[PDB]
Design a protein that fits this description.
Organism: Klebsiella pneumoniae
GO biological process, one term: beta-lactam antibiotic catabolic process
Bound molecules: ligand AIX
GO molecular function, one term: beta-lactamase activity
Catalytic activity: a beta-lactam + H2O = a substituted beta-amino acid
Number of helices: 8
Helix content: 25-40%
Protein name: Beta-lactamase
Distance between the termini: 11 Å
Number of domains: 1
Number of strands: 9
Largest sheet: 5 strands, antiparallel
CATH architecture: 3-Layer(aba) Sandwich
Length: 260
């Protein structure tokens, strides 16, 4: 098709490996590029950890208000929010917001501990029908993004289908789904990614991710005013371990997609 040629064109211009999946929920049609390929999710896996805690909240109604200690042993490479509350507590809602809207790695690890380990995150993915997602490690080592390593990976197709079920479908409760949607709106880390390639009149909820080998990821759910919603997944990784981030590729992929 035409979109596949331009996506393949910008992948060649980038020197890396692009993975794209858009779900057009108007006709339930799909446009995919390397859609069944394994990519490191990096911090985009935090959506699955936040959604899994939200699923736990459908029986323990008062769970997001439960305080959780933050103390020096908990801090790792990048903790923009949990750094402010060391030797204090942080409720599971403020850690979920820190993980989604600021990509706080300590918040992720607290989300992972609440679920009983990374196997508890993968469990929730299998329960909602995702057989491809797998979380193996905690932050920050889940961002190693070594080529060929199946650890902490998924495919663009699977993550787009899952993100549709979480934010648009009914894999979560309505109070849970509205909370995750409201969280993805408040994201502060995706200005130069998928958002930069979409019309400004388009409201977007997204979660970014980045790691070694220049991995630059972004998953988004998009609501054009007057039109049926879209979910977009753009994964990108590079051959050099020390490669720099390429958020511009993610914006250009979304621009090629938005022209459809
Ligand atoms: C997940 O993607 C996280 N990335 C890391 O922990 C990497 N070790 C790292 C890469 C680059 C700079 C700092 C740490 C966090 N999520 C990224 C993102 O959302 O773009 C991040 C750069 C904010 S860190």
């Amino acid at each position: 098709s035409a979109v596949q040629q331009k996506l393949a064109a910008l992948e060649k211009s980038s020197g890396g490996r692009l993975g794209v999946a858009l779900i057009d929920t108007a006709d339930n049609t799909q446009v995919l590029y390397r859609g069944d390929e394994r990519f490191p999710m990096c911090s985009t896996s935090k959506v699955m950890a936040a959604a899994a805690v939200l699923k736990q909240s459908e029986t323990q109604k008062q769970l997001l208000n439960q305080p959780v200690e933050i103390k020096p042993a908990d801090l790792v490479n990048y903790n923009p929010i949990a750094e402010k509350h060391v030797n204090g507590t942080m409720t599971l809602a403020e850690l979920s917001a820190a993980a989604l809207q600021y990509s706080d790695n300590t918040a992720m690890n607290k989300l992972i501990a609440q679920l009983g380990g990374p196997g508890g995150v993968t469990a929730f993915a299998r329960a909602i029908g995702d057989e491809t997602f797998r979380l193996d490690r905690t932050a920050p080592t889940l961002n190693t993004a070594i080529p060929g390593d199946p650890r902490d990976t998924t495919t663009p197709r699977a993550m787009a289908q899952t993100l549709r079920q979480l934010t648009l479908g009914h894999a979560l409760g309505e109070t849970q789904r509205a909370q995750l949607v409201t969280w993805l709106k408040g994201n502060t880390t995706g200005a130069a990614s998928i958002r930069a390639g979409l019309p400004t009149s388009w409201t977007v909820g997204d979660k970014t991710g980045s790691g070694d080998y220049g991995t630059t990821n972004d998953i988004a759910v998009i609501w054009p005013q007057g039109r049926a919603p879209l979910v977009l997944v753009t994964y990108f990784t590079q051959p050099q371990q020390n490669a720099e981030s390429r958020r511009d590729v993610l914006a250009s992929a979304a621009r090629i997609i938005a022209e459809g």
